């Protein structure tokens, strides 16, 4: 599932948590995938999709809200969007859709 891939990404790869750093990565062109929490506001979701299509970046929609995304990424705070910068030894980039 996505929880195992995300956990392996946290423990091995590179990631950034939060809207501002995610947009920074997208506009730097150095993000591989962005995972958006289900309860993210739709305007923010659409802007992230616009940034991702401009940077030719893949978007995955997490089934949980920000609380569930924070738990999945292994943090004790809510996470609205995750940007995978390096996948590490994880198949999250390729095992999509």
């Amino acid at each position: 599932s996505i929880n195992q891939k995300l956990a392996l990404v946290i423990k091995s790869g590179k990631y950034t948590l939060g809207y501002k750093s995610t947009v920074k990565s997208l506009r730097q062109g150095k993000s591989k995938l962005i995972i958006i929490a289900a309860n993210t506001p739709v305007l923010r979701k659409s802007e992230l999709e616009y940034y991702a299509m401009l940077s030719k970046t893949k978007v995955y929609y997490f089934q949980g809200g920000n609380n569930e995304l924070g738990t999945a990424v292994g943090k004790l705070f809510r996470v609205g969007v995750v940007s995978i910068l390096e996948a590490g030894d994880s198949d999250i980039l390729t095992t999509l859709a």
Binding site: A37, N39, P41, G65, N66, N67, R78
Partner: protein, 91 residues
């Protein structure tokens, strides 16, 4: 310390109005004064205004709900019934 054994919030009513009435009022007052998770921002910041109005201190969004709880059991079953009927209509 624990200041009361069982009255809880209804310790403000003293010995008046009867134990059973104070018990009912305790349950509904705790229910109406609790903080609830916001379905939009994901924070436990939804508090009641007047009866039936539940506003999130964060993101300033307010939802119509039950008088003393954010969502009633009637609300859950009506939402489910409308979802079922809507899905049948659309497919």
């Amino acid at each position: 310390a624990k200041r009361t054994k069982k009255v809880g919030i209804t310790g403000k009513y003293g010995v008046r109005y009867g134990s059973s009435l104070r018990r009912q009022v305790k349950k509904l007052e705790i229910q109406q004064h609790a903080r609830y998770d916001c379905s939009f921002c994901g924070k436990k910041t939804v508090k009641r205004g007047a009866a039936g109005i539940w506003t999130c201190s964060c993101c300033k969004k307010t939802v119509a709900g039950g008088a003393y709880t954010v969502s009633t059991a009637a609300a859950a079953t009506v939402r489910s019934t409308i979802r079922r009927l809507r899905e049948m209509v659309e497919a």
